[PDB]
C-alpha cells in the first residue's frame, strides 16, 4: 500500500521513543535479547518459542524486513507477551513491561491513516 512507508516512519518514531532515555527506567529489560544462560533462566527457551527484543526490532526495521506497520506491531507485542508468559504477574519486570506497553499502545493508536 502507498501508505506503508509513512506508517513505517511512524513505527520507526515509536521504536526510537521506546529506546530513548525518557523511558529507560522501565524499558531497559527489553533492549537486548534475554540471555537465559547468563541469568540462570534454564527453562526460558522451553517456555518462550519466539524470543523478541527491541534490538531485534531495530535490526528488522533497519534491514527493511517489516513490510507494514501490522508486522512491526506484532513483534513489539510478542516481546511483551513473552514477558507476561515467563514471569509471575507480580514481578517488577512485568510492571516495567506494562508501562512500556502503555507507551507503545498509546502512540501506535495515533498512526496516520
UniProtKB/Swiss-Prot annotation:
UniProt feature coiled coil, ranges: none
Listed result of changing residue 39 to A: Reduced binding to histone H4 acetylated at 'Lys-12' (H4K12ac)
Highest taxon above the source species: Eukaryota
Effect of residue 87 to A: Abolished binding to histone H4 acetylated at 'Lys-12' (H4K12ac)
Bromo domain: residues covered: 6-111
S-S bridge residues: none
Subcellular location: Nucleus; Chromosome
General function of this protein: Chromatin reader protein that specifically recognizes and binds histone H4 acetylated at 'Lys-5' and 'Lys-12' (H4K5ac and H4K12ac, respectively), thereby controlling gene expression and remodeling chromatin structures. Recruits transcription factors and coactivators to target gene sites, and activates RNA polymerase II machinery for transcriptional elongation.
Other remarks in the entry: Some specific inhibitors of BRD2 that prevent binding to acetylated histone are promising therapeutic molecules for the treatment of cancers or inflammatory diseases. ABBV-744, a small molecule, has been tested on tumors with success: ABBV-744 antiproliferative activity is mainly restricted to cell lines of acute myeloid leukaemia and prostate cancer and is able to displace BRD4 from chromatin. GSK046 (iBET-BD2), which specifically inhibits the second bromo domain, is a promising therapeutic small molecule for the treatment of inflammatory and autoimmune diseases.
Domain remarks: The first bromo domain specifically recognizes histone H4 acetylated at 'Lys-12' (H4K12ac). It also specifically binds histone H4 acetyl-methylated at 'Lys-5' and 'Lys-12' (H4K5acme and H4K12acme, respectively). The second bromo domain recognizes and binds histone H4 acetylated at 'Lys-5' and 'Lys-12' (H4K5ac and H4K12ac, respectively).
Protein family per UniProt: Belongs to the BET family.
Assembly behavior: Homodimer. Interacts with E2F1. Interacts with (acetylated) STAT3; promoting STAT3 recruitment to chromatin. Interacts with CTCF; promoting BRD2 recruitment to chromatin.
Designated name of the protein: Bromodomain-containing protein 2
Source organism of this protein record: Homo sapiens
Species classification: Eukaryota, Metazoa, Chordata, Craniata, Vertebrata
Gene name of the record: BRD2
Portion held of the full protein: 348 to 455 of 801
Amino acid at each position: 500500500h502507498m501508505q506503508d512507508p509513512e506508517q513505517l516512519k511512524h513505527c520507526n518514531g515509536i521504536l526510537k521513543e521506546l529506546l530513548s532515555k525518557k523511558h529507560a527506567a522501565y524499558a531497559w529489560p527489553f533492549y537486548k535479547p534475554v540471555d537465559a544462560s547468563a541469568l540462570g533462566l534454564h527453562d526460558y527457551h522451553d517456555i518462550i518459542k519466539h524470543p523478541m527484543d527491541l534490538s531485534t526490532v531495530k535490526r528488522k526495521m533497519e534491514n527493511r524486513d517489516y513490510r507494514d506497520a501490522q508486522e512491526f506491531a506484532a513483534d513489539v507485542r510478542l516481546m511483551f507477551s513473552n514477558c507476561y508468559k515467563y514471569n509471575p504477574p507480580d514481578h517488577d519486570v512485568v510492571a516495567m513491561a506494562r508501562k512500556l506497553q502503555d507507551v507503545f499502545e498509546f502512540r501506535y493508536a495515533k498512526m496516520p491513516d
